[PDB]
Design a protein around this ligand. Sequence first.
Ligand code: HEC
Ligand code: HEC
Length: 123
Amino acid sequence: IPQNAEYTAECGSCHMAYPANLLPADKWRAITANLENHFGDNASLDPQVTARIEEYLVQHAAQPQKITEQAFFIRKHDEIPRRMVQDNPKVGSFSQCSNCHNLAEKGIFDEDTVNIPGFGRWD
Ligand code: HEC
Ligand code: HEC
């Protein structure tokens, strides 16, 4: 099975499994160091599973903060108005990327395939 199989199961449980290359290693370690305190939820795992997740993310990282707080993310999304996101009940926030980028879990974020629920294709 592929290298991300366990990751997808464990970290795809409450939201989509974010590709490892969306954060650098130190930012992934800040998340996996205290999964019991995870953005309002408890994402704790057994220690050996935790360790394999951390090791996967660190190894495959971009070469606790959110993805949606990174400057690359804010830049890419700064023309999208709040009516389509925070005020859009079918979206609500940018965190669940797969609501707009249907193949986000496969790493596909291309603008030409984005479709915002309730609004349609962007391009
Ligand atoms: C439910 C018990 C969760 C599990 C299992 C995991 N995560 Fe999670 N994560 C959870 C919540 C409630 C949130 C906040 C969403 C909100 O809309 O703000 C998150 C968020 C993240 C993020 C940030 C997303 C963003 O807005 O940029 C990341 C990077 C993240 N979670 C990673 C992650 C990993 C690596 C997990 C397995 C160890 C994992 N999450 C599991 C809830 C839950
Ligand atoms: C719908 C409300 C979105 C959510 C949720 C996320 N993204 Fe997005 N993204 C969206 C649009 C409409 C656009 C195009 C913006 C326009 O002004 O061009 C994007 C673009 C990206 C890109 C760049 C894609 C390209 O072709 O260059 C990336 C890398 C990207 N988005 C990533 C991303 C991630 C990681 C998200 C969840 C944390 C995410 N997006 C959410 C709309 C929406």
